[PDB]
Design a protein around this nucleic acid. Structure first.
Ligand SMILES: [Cl-]
Ligand SMILES: [Cl-]
Ligand SMILES: [Cl-]
Ligand SMILES: [Mg+2]
Ligand SMILES: [Mg+2]
Ligand SMILES: [Mg+2]
Ligand SMILES: [Mg+2]
Ligand SMILES: [Mg+2]
Ligand SMILES: [Mg+2]
Ligand SMILES: [Mg+2]
Ligand SMILES: [Mg+2]
Ligand SMILES: [Mg+2]
Ligand SMILES: [Mg+2]
Ligand SMILES: [Mg+2]
Ligand SMILES: [Mg+2]
Ligand code: NA
Ligand code: NA
Ligand code: NA
Ligand code: NA
Ligand code: NA
Ligand code: NA
Ligand code: NA
Ligand code: NA
Ligand code: NA
Ligand code: NA
Ligand code: NA
Ligand code: NA
Ligand code: NA
Ligand code: NA
Ligand code: NA
Ligand code: NA
Ligand code: NA
Ligand code: NA
Ligand code: NA
Ligand SMILES: [Sr+2]
Ligand SMILES: [Sr+2]
Ligand SMILES: [Sr+2]
Ligand SMILES: [Sr+2]
Ligand SMILES: [Sr+2]
Ligand SMILES: [Sr+2]
Ligand SMILES: [Sr+2]
Ligand SMILES: [Sr+2]
Ligand SMILES: [Sr+2]
Ligand SMILES: [Sr+2]
Ligand SMILES: [Sr+2]
Ligand SMILES: [Sr+2]
Ligand SMILES: [Sr+2]
Ligand SMILES: [Sr+2]
Ligand SMILES: [Sr+2]
Ligand SMILES: [Sr+2]
Lengths: 115, 145, 119, 246
RNA sequence: UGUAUGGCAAGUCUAACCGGAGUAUCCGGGGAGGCACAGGGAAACCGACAUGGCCGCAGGGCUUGCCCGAGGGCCGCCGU
RNA sequence: UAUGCCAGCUGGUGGAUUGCUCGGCUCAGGCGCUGAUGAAGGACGUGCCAAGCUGCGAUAAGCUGUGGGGAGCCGCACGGAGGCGAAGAACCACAGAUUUCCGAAUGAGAAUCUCUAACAAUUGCUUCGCGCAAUGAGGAACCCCGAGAACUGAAACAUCUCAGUAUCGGGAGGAACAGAAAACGCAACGUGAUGUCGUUAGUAACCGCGAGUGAACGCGAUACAGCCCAAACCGAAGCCCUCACGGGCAAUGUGGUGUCAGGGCUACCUCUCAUCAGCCGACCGUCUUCACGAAGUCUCUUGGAAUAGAGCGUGAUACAGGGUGACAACCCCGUACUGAAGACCAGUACGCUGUGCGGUAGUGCCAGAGUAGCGGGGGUUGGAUAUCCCUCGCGAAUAACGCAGGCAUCGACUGCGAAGGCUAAACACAACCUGAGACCGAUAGUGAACAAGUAGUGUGAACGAACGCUGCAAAGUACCCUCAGAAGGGAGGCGAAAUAGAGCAUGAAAUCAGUUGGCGAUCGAGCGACAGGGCAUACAAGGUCCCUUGACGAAUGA
């Protein structure tokens, strides 16, 4: 049982978008967020740079950390970003909250899940 | 409700027969007792192995991989920008209480660096020289002979 | 102390001179104005009016002041025994108000009239 | 956002920008964790006498006299937990760490979050506070710090339609249970928090349920009593500014 | 040594203690030191994949079997 | 229906429960020695009437003084008699008087008494006389120096472990001990007295290399403070007692100098604000105690009583807590604010008097012996070759020398001067004072809320309970009847209540008396569960239930 009200709302929002719109991603992200904290994603930048491509939103079902270099013009969506992560991403691309990604793309199209 | 909280009424509190939870006999002796007899399993074998050198004749080197230097060069604007030049002794943490500073060769070197340190690995040189750079040994580093 | 046990203890186990404050009653409107005090230590010559018990509304002279029991006897505020004898009903000075004072003592009068001290 | 400043008569006197911390997302679980820690950290170590019930040379007679192997002295049972006058088996121990640790970042986030809960008028009304305002917190001028009389603060809060909260806290509850015997007979609702800058308001402190604080040290507890976010607060113009860098 | 929850994250946490104060709470200091950030070898001493290949779950894409395929799996390769 | 079974009703018994807290428990701050000037402890006394407790000491619940306090008082303890107090008592603070006997117990003896002038005993000084002094014993633990187990762990057990623990002997203080390097040894161009706290670290080290055991240097803090001899060179220039006189000490050396920024001597330069001795002497802070101190005791209703409900009003730098006939900021004590005193910090800091810091050159003048060191045997330690100590034997140098830097020797290097001494502050404990509590709430919490280390047990060492609650106010039951009767009973009186009537709030269960319902002297025993009948039932808090017929109608099914 999650104790954070904001995470409980995010999960409920990801579920609403999965059922209402044509997305399968948001329900898949909701299922991972309902799972224990240790199973959540702790991803550094060197992994987003390796596996992501432009005009395809990167969805992290956890938190993005700041180790490594990111050169690609990618839009990264996550539950949270570290201070350095968000700074390094905004220099070459855009760090967006998973809450905004649900409003901008309720259908969950052209999206890559990275962990 | 915890496991502990549901025990009133169980009598044995999960211990099986009430003849179980008594003294040290239930544990096979006190502490590490029987580490070679009845409970030898998963214990490190008996014996002496090796020697130790006196702590004041021991050297502690402060290490850093080329990858750590290379990923943070644009962020290290507080250090020399040549035709990049960086004194490694000023980058590594805990380099005060250390004997010497050594640059190791793990990762890639995407920039042209001129590194100044007390020691370098064969691979640390190869990666820096292989991407248009130089390696400078200190006056303290003049021990390699 | 803020602790109830210690508070009640200091009141019951208080020395005789400190028990004077346990026999204090509020002064009337006129007497408060005349002497600049809200209350006074009830004396065996004062006239008092009962404000709270079964004798509420009755006036009378203070006949006795017991410091040890921190209680007072007022004239006609009595109880009738089985034999017929009218014995005094002890009153707490907190349920009482002073209407007239006994100023036969020079020290008590001076204490009441001084702005720096109180009686 | 913008915060309306009020003078000592309760009329508007301009407006300054409401600082960024008041937009920190309300997080009741973190606020509650910080109040739980503060309440626990002031609790005193206690425990029964280590030797209570052990001061006896009582011995068991063993088998033979048709009696249970219970330690006896002068034909009276002693020491053992099942015996009257015996030791307490698992008693409260003085050695127990009754303190809760909290990370500075986690605690600081809770202070910021509780400060932010103070800016939402609906959360403040949900907490229980009685007031007739739209704008919350109540921002007053620095001349509030110069007030001496309590009755003068009553007039200002009546002019600010925020006095109804003190009427709510003007009712002492005589608690159920033995706390009475230990000094905890009464309790009352928590009302308005007064955050000043120089010194805590001597003028406002005695008001029913009121708590006075200063911007440099106002904590999670005075900002959210009992862990419940959204306390009806009143800041001094300089207090609002200083509470920004917290 | 696990686990659940929460903060922060290539970092993280302060300990004693100091100042403040609403004075055991609490606010601000304090990174000494600990653990993590490289390992292997008794020691001397030496010192690593920010990815080279193939499968492929979830998910995404398309002209609806075909592509991209984090994680995972099988290998290579690297340090000692 | 007898004896009797089950449930209940009325009344007991019992004292659970609920409510209450004069006691505990724990934490925190402050403070901290007493005694031959006879302590602490104990004994026996002491009151108008006095058994216990408390106090006190033949001046005996007290005497005197100053201050405070105040119209009352004569302790716990509300009686009777009587007395004291405006000649200012009680009561509180400080100071003083008195202060029996035993007790370190000291003239000698002795179960608290006795016998014929007493520092007994051991010491120092000495006028060699007990003339002047000292020691003894106590204290909650803390502290320091010695002696030193075992159960236990190792699943046995011997080394090891429990543990230098328990316990024992000796001793100091308000704190002890330690302490100005023959140090450290992140080896350095580095640190710089000592405790202690955090860490270093369960690291190094030990160990039937099993189980287990276990530092330090350094670092971050706390607090900070550095000095005096011996000797050289001087050589009576000196010290103690006494008012003085005078006496005593002292060449086997008092005193000057000096003490690793080595010193002394000789020759010079300059100078002191060091050091040492001594005078003066706090602020602040902290702890405790004290003075002062705002505003309702208005209306109505209920009540035995208003702090309750409804209504009206007030203070607040004071809405902590307590008391008061029920829940109180405004009735009383207090509480905020301001101020005062004492104690501790502390005879410290600061200030002051005196003294004089230091430098150059020369000078083998001085600088702590059973020592440093080696060996035999033991203990102890993490100390391993490399801990610390004891014991027996041996045993050096002289600063041009010596010790240390974790095996020995020699050389180098770096550090440092042992075998003389003192030393503030930061830390331990909790007797004593005060404060605090998510502690217990009378079979709990102390053994002890009560006569508590009491009653009581044991020759003794020692052991050791139980017992809290009338009521707003004693108004604590007059009178009458009965009776052997201050008994008890009846009637009666008080109070809101006597089923509040004295171990008297509430008043459970086991259980007892009387009684109600059901069963009952021809009948069978886990005492019941589920069905269904008899009989029994005031209200309230449940309101359903029966029969004809009709509707629907699963499986099954004439
Ligand atoms: Cl990663
Ligand atoms: Cl080694
Ligand atoms: Cl050092
Ligand atoms: Mg007056
Ligand atoms: Mg007990
Ligand atoms: Mg209860
Ligand atoms: Mg004698
Ligand atoms: Mg054994
Ligand atoms: Mg073995
Ligand atoms: Mg040991
Ligand atoms: Mg060392
Ligand atoms: Mg001298
Ligand atoms: Mg040993
Ligand atoms: Mg008891
Ligand atoms: Mg009763
Ligand atoms: Na058992
Ligand atoms: Na260092
Ligand atoms: Na005992
Ligand atoms: Na029995
Ligand atoms: Na503790
Ligand atoms: Na650090
Ligand atoms: Na019979
Ligand atoms: Na003391
Ligand atoms: Na007596
Ligand atoms: Na005396
Ligand atoms: Na003597
Ligand atoms: Na003599
Ligand atoms: Na065993
Ligand atoms: Na045996
Ligand atoms: Na051993
Ligand atoms: Na009253
Ligand atoms: Na020896
Ligand atoms: Na050394
Ligand atoms: Na009892
Ligand atoms: Sr189990
Ligand atoms: Sr046992
Ligand atoms: Sr074996
Ligand atoms: Sr460091
Ligand atoms: Sr009395
Ligand atoms: Sr009395
Ligand atoms: Sr037998
Ligand atoms: Sr931190
Ligand atoms: Sr120092
Ligand atoms: Sr010497
Ligand atoms: Sr050597
Ligand atoms: Sr009892
Ligand atoms: Sr016997
Ligand atoms: Sr009667
Ligand atoms: Sr049968
Ligand atoms: Sr049919």
């Amino acid at each position: 049982s999650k104790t954070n009200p904001r995470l409980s709302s995010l999960i409920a929002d990801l579920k609403s978008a999965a059922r209402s719109s044509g997305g399968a991603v948001w329900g898949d992200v909701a299922e991972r967020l309902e799972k224990p904290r240790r199973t959540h994603a702790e991803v550094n930048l060197g992994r987003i740079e390796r596996y992501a491509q432009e005009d395809e939103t990167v969805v992290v079902p956890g938190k993005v950390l700041g180790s490594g270099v990111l050169q690609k013009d990618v839009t990264v969506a996550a539950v949270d970003f570290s201070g350095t992560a968000e700074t390094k991403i905004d220099q070459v691309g855009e760090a967006v909250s998973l809450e905004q990604a649900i409003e901008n793309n309720p259908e969950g199209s052209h999206v890559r899940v990275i962990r | 409700t915890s496991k502990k909280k549901r025990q009133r009424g169980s009598r044995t509190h999960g211990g099986g027969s009430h003849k179980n939870r008594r003294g040290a006999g239930h544990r096979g002796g006190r502490g590490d007792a029987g580490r070679d007899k009845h409970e030898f399993h998963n214990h490190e074998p008996l014996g002496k192995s090796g020697f130790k050198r006196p702590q004041k004749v021991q050297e502690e080197a402060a290490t850093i991989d080329v990858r750590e230097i290379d990923e943070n060069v644009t962020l290290l604007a507080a250090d020399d920008v040549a035709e990049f030049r960086v004194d490694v002794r000023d980058v590594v943490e805990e380099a005060d209480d250390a004997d010497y500073v050594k640059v190791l060769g793990a990762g890639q070197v995407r920039h042209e660096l001129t590194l100044i340190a007390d020691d370098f690995s064969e691979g640390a040189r190869e990666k820096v020289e292989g991407a248009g750079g130089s390696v400078e040994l200190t006056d303290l580093g003049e021990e390699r002979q | 102390s803020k602790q109830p046990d210690k508070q009640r203890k200091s009141q019951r186990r208080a020395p005789l001179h400190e028990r004077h404050k346990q026999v204090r009653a509020t002064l009337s409107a006129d007497l408060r104005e005349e002497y600049g005090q809200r209350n006074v230590r009830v004396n065996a010559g004062d006239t008092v009016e009962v404000l709270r018990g079964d004798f509420a509304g009755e006036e009378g002279e203070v006949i006795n002041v017991d410091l040890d029991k921190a209680v007072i006897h007022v004239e006609d505020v009595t109880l009738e025994k089985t034999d017929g004898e009218e014995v005094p009903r002890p009153l707490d000075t907190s349920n009482v108000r002073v209407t007239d004072l006994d100023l036969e003592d020079e020290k008590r009068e001076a204490r009441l009239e001084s702005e720096d001290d109180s009686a | 956002m913008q915060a309306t400043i009020y003078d000592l008569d309760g009329n508007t006197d301009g407006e300054v920008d409401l600082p960024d911390v008041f937009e920190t997302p309300v997080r009741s679980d973190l606020i509650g964790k910080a109040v739980r820690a503060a309440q626990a950290n002031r609790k005193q170590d206690y425990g029964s006498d280590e030797y209570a019930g052990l001061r006896t040379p009582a011995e068991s007679f063993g088998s033979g006299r048709g009696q249970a192997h219970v330690p006896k002295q002068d034909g009276r049972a002693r020491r053992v937990p099942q015996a009257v006058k015996g030791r307490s088996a698992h008693p409260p121990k003085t050695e127990k760490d009754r303190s809760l640790d909290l990370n500075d970042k986690e605690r600081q986030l809770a202070v910021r979050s509780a400060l932010a809960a103070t800016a939402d008028a609906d959360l403040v009304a949900d907490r229980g506070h009685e007031f007739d305002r739209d704008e919350v917190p109540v921002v007053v001028s620095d001349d509030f710090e110069d007030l001496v009389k309590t009755q003068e603060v009553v007039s200002l809060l009546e002019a600010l339609d925020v006095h109804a909260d003190i009427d709510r806290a003007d009712e002492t509850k005589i608690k159920a249970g033995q706390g009475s015997a230990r000094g905890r007979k009464y309790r009352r609702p928590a009302s308005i928090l007064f955050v000043t800058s120089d010194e805590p308001s001597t003028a406002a402190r005695n008001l029913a349920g009121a708590d006075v604080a200063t911007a440099s040290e106002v904590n999670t507890e005075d900002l959210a009593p009992g862990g419940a976010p959204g306390r009806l607060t009143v800041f001094t113009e300089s207090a609002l500014a200083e509470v920004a860098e917290r």
